[PDB]
Amino acid sequence: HHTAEAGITGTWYNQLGSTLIVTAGADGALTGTYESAVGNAEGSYVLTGRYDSAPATDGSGTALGWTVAWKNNYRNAHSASTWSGQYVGGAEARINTQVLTTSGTTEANAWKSTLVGHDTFTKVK
Ligand SMILES: C[C@@H]1NC(=O)N[C@@H]1CCCCCC(=O)O
Ligand code: NA
Ligand code: NI
C-alpha cells in the first residue's frame, strides 16, 4: 500500500492535553519543545524532527516526524517517543500522527519496550 513551513510553525495541542511548540525551517528542519500532559514527564523537553519542505500540491498532506527523549532537568523516564504523520492545512488544520514510545529495557524484556499510539494535534486547545 506504500506553505508547510508557515503552516506547521507554532503551537499545537493534542487530545491528551499535551503541548507542542515547533519551528519549521526552510530546508526541512523541525525544532522546538514538547510538554506532555501524561506519563512520567514534567516541564518541557527538547523536540527535533524533519518535514517535507516541498510537498505535493494535489490535495495531499505534508509528511513529517519528530522525536522527544524524555529527559530534561527535572526527570528522566529513560524513554523516547517518535511521532510520524502528516500536516493537513486549512481552517481546521491538523497534524495527524501515530507515535512509538520506546523505553530502555533489559534484553529479556525487549518485547515490551515499545508502545504504539495515535495523537491528533490542533491549533486550538
Ligand atoms: C506519546 C504520548 N503523547 C503524549 O503527548 N505524551 C505521551 C508520551 C508520554 C511519555 C512520557 C515519558 C514516559 O512516561 O515514559
Ligand atoms: Na523491543
Ligand atoms: Ni512512562
Structural domains of the chain ordered from first start? 1-125 (2.40.128.30)
Query: What does 9-40 look like in DSSP terms, one character per residue?
Result: -EEEEETTS-EEEEEE-TTSEEEEEEE-SSSS
Local structure of residue 91 (DSSP, 8 states): T
Separation between Cα atoms, residue 95 and residue 13, nearest integer Å? 10
d(CA 59, CA 66): 23
Contact of 22 with 9, CB cutoff 8 Å: yes
Ligand 1 binding residues, C-beta < 6 A = 14, 16, 18, 36, 38-41, 70, 77, 79, 81, 99, 101, 117, 119
- Nine-digit cell at 121? 494535534
**What are the Cα distances from residue 119, in Å, to 12, 34, 106, 108?**
11, 13, 28, 29
Ligand 1 pocket, mutate which of 42, 101, 118, 125 (most atoms under 8 A from CB): 101
Residue type, position 69, single letter: A
**Using CB atoms within 10 A of its CB, is residue 47 exposed (0-12), middle (13-18) or buried (19+)?**
buried
Q: How far apart are CA 24 and CA 16, in angstroms?
A: 23
Looking at the chain, the number of H-run helices and the number of E-run strands are 1, 8
Rounded to the nearest 5 percent, the helix, strand and coil shares of the chain are 5, 55, 40
